[PDB]
């Protein structure tokens, strides 16, 4: 159907380059102006760059002028963003965006957006988490602290998945070290502390780190 | 051109008429668009040219205004309309700038947090750092103040918080605050307290432990 599919995102060191791609299908891509728009973690939307339908004009946000170049392949129906001199501040989801068609002298709103591709810029080294119990002392709370890992994501389950009700796995916070940290918690009937065993299963695929930690009172 | 949205959050129920406000720092005529975005997903255009309903968008969405003052109205909130809404200008010689969003969250009755405190684990202590975590569980509304006290000394700059998204079953939030100290600094003091102020609590609640006890 009518879609935009971005790719090319990943984790990259500062100073390096990365090329994003956006494959368009279902419409006459070579008649549309196209944009890149980005969204930093927890933030709002920020325009990045525009390219005319025929590549004849291009404009760029202050923060990317001289570093990024937008281009298009009107035979393969693909949009590109060449990102050079990457810096931590470029960490964001990047969306390719189609402008609503208009007649006349003026451009229009953004009527079609891709799913986005995530660029993370960091000098941190890949590293699995340390996993520590959050020990429980008529409802009891317990959990696992998942500390000092890079890059995102980790996945946390409880009892191999047999425990889902009452579980809250918090969004990661990025520490000043450049490493992430999160906690997963669950509330359980305090009478079940002795009777049931509680194990958190942390998996960090970037580092092939898998930890199963038993949390006891 | 800077776009300013208000309110930054509102609480509403299914069936409610909701109206969001967008202001431009200078006139943008009618070159103004509204978008909906849900967590982890891309924005979807709702309204363009300030009052034109985008193709295929439900008719409960409408937009009004021109110049510097704009509104978006949902005539009757549906269960899938809880999201963040952005306005955006595309005025001549003005590039493209977005407001910071208005989050439409689910209203429910007040729910005071359950508060738990977790001392550093012995395993982490051997590594030279102490993480102390305060957990606020299943509360509403999201506004909460969490203060770390160490031997009655208010802490600043050494903690971080994380909040969940509104729970799909009970429409509550949960929050963690983690105080991070070196092993050496931890052992310098005895009393560690988390103090929680929330409108569901008549007085602030303090949960504490004595180091080692």
């Amino acid at each position: 159907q009518v879609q935009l599919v971005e790719s090319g995102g990943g984790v990259v060191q500062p100073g390096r380059s990365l090329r994003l791609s956006c494959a368009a299908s279902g419409f006459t891509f070579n008649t549309y102006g196209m944009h890149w728009v980005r969204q930093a973690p927890g933030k709002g939307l920020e325009w990045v760059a525009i390219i005319w339908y025929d590549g004849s004009q291009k404009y760029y946000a202050d923060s990317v002028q001289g570093r990024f170049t937008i281009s298009r392949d009107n035979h393969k129906n693909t949009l590109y963003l060449q990102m050079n001199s990457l810096r931590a501040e470029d960490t964001a989801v990047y969306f390719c965006v189609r402008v609503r068609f208009s007649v006349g002298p003026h451009g229009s709103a953004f009527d079609l957006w891709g799913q986005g591709t995530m660029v993370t810029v960091s000098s941190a080294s890949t590293k699995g988490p340390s996993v520590f119990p959050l020990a429980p002392s008529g409802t009891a709370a317990l959990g696992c602290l998942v500390k000092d890992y890079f890059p995102e994501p980790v996945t946390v389950s409880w009892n191999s998945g047999a425990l889902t009700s009452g579980v809250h796995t918090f969004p990661a916070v990025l520490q000043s070290s450049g490493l992430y940290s999160l906690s997963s918690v669950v509330t359980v009937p305090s009478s079940s502390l002795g009777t049931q065993t509680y194990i958190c299963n942390v998996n960090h695929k970037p580092s092939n780190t898998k930890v199963d930690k038993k949390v006891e009172p | 051109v800077q776009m300013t949205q208000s309110p930054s959050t509102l609480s509403a129920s299914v069936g409610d008429r909701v109206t969001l406000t967008c202001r431009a720092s200078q006139s943008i005529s009618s070159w103004l668009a509204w978008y909906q975005q849900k967590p982890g997903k891309a924005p979807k255009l709702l309204i363009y040219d300030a009052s034109s309903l985008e193709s295929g968008v439900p008719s409960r969405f409408s937009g009004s205004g021109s110049g510097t003052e704009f509104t978006l109205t949902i005539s009757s909130l549906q269960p899938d309309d809880f999201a963040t809404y952005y306005c955006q200008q595309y005025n001549s010689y003005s590039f493209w700038t977005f407001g910071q969003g208005t989050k439409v969250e689910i209203k429910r009755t007040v729910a005071a947090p359950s508060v738990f405190i977790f001392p550093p684990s012995d395993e982490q202590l051997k590594s030279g750092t102490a993480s102390v975590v305060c957990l606020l569980n299943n509360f509403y509304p999201r506004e909460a103040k969490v203060q770390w006290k160490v031997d009655n000394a208010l802490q600043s700059g050494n903690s971080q918080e994380s909040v969940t998204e509104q729970d799909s079953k009970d429409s509550t939030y949960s929050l963690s605050s983690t105080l991070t100290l070196s092993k050496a600094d931890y052992e310098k003091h005895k009393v560690y307290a988390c103090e929680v102020t929330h409108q569901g609590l008549s007085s602030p609640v303090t949960k504490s432990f004595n180091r080692g006890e």
Partner: peptide, 10 residues
């Protein structure tokens, strides 16, 4: 001085 906001479509 071209308007970046001018129509970018065919």
């Amino acid at each position: 001085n071209p308007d970046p906001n001018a129509n970018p479509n065919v």
